[PDB]
Amino acid sequence: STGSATTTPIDSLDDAYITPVQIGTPAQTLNLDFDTGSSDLWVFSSETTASEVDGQTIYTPSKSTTAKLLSGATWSISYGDGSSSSGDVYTDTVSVGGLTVTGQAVESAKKVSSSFTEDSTIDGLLGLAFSTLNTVSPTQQKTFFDNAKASLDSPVFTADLGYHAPGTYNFGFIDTTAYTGSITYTAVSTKQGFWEWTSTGYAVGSGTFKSTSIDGIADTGTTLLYLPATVVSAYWAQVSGAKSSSSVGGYVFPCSATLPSFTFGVGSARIVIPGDYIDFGPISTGSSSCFGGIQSSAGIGINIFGDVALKAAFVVFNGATTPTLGFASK
Numbered sequence: 265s266t267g268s269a270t271t272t273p274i275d276s277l278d279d280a281y282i283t284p285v286q287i288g289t290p291a292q293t294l295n296l297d298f299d300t301g302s303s304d305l306w307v308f309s310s311e312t313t314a315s316e317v318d319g320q321t322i323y324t325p326s327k328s329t330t331a332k333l334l335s336g337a338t339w340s341i342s343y344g345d346g347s348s349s350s351g352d353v354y355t356d357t358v359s360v361g362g363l364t365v366t367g368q369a370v371e372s373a374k375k376v377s378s379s380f381t382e383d384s385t386i387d388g389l390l391g392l393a394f395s396t397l398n399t400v401s402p403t404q405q406k407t408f409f410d411n412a413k414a415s416l417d418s419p420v421f422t423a424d425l426g427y428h429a430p431g432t433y434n435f436g437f438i439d440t441t442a443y444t445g446s447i448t449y450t451a452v453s454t455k456q457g458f459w460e461w462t463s464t465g466y467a468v469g470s471g472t473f474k475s476t477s478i479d480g481i482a483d484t485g486t487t488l489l490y491l492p493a494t495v496v497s498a499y500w501a502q503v504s505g506a507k508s509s510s511s512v513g514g515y516v517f518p519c520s521a522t523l524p525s526f527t528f529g530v531g532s533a534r535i536v537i538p539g540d541y542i543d544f545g546p547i548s549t550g551s552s553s554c555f556g557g558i559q560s561s562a563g564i565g566i567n568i569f570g571d572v573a574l575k576a577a578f579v580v581f582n583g584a585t586t587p588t589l590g591f592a593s594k
């Protein structure tokens with residue numbers, strides 16, 4: 265089997281991407297944020313505290329003839345930004361882009377943080393990291409990908425995010441029309457439950473490539489590129505008037521600037537992030553200070569190749585017995 269779904273930016277900055285997901289019988293379509301940095305499929309629901317819902321579409325298990333309460337099971341997650349959600353669990357039929365999983369754990373939110381309530385466009389998250397990070401207790405649950413894997417033509421999914429444009433998530437096949445050149449594969453460590461890999465270095469604009477190992481995770485659920493402070497300082501030093509602002513919470517730059525590209529290594533290959541991808545616009549409405557899309561990881565404890573980096577590539581998440589990542593230009 266295979267599946268193929270379009271993923272759409274939620275706003276003009278590509279802060280996040282939503283993908284339609286069919287849950288239950290008859291289908292209830294919710295727009296979920298596919299998140300390669302977490303392992304819970306959780307949704308706004310008929311159980312969510314009413315004051316914490318503001319425009320999201322909700323899953324109503326009582327309207328699904330295939331929904332079963334997973335008796336005794338609860339979940340609670342805290343994301344790296346400080347956001348959170350928690351609740352109880354149903355199993356139901358879940359379909360993405362024509363690929364169907366029966367008996368998928370659908371984590372129903374009783375509580376969400378204000379940061380989720382405020383995002384009316386996001387109806388929940390579909391985690392695609394390893395199932396060892398799933399938060400359901402007392403019986404840990406599998407991701408949609410882990411449940412689908414055995415049925416897929418090939419045990420893979422691919423992320424093809426757009427810059428200010430829709431893109432695609434494919435499950436079970438590699439669309440050889442969607443990238444240029446060849447795919448360069450690189451080793452993955454699953455020891456922390458992430459798609460963790462090592463980049464071979466970086467360049468700033470037209471500058472020389474610096475060979476240096478940078479461990480990090482491929483995380484579609486994170487907007488920006490978080491890298492070590494040495495690398496980030498080298499990038500922003502090439503932008504007149506850029507500075508790190510403790511008041512704003514990262515590097516800012518004059519909105520009049522033209523940003524240089526950023527290149528990262530994948531083995532002997534190179535992925536080039538155009539400068540425009542690194543512009544996240546005014547810090548507040550009307551400001552002439554703009555927020556940068558490359559930020560320090562120093563306060564995080566991990567480097568994160570989030571959407572700023574991933575949208576510059578066609579990315580293969582290879583879930584074979586020995587997982588690997590693949591990157592291609594596009």
Ligand SMILES: CN1CCCc2cc(CN)ccc21
Pocket residue numbers: 280297299301302343345347379380383386485486
């Ligand atoms: C609060 N916020 C809404 C936008 C999508 C989203 C995704 C994650 C997962 N990294 C965490 C928070 C969050």
Ligand code: NA
Pocket residue numbers: 555
């Ligand atoms: Na921000």
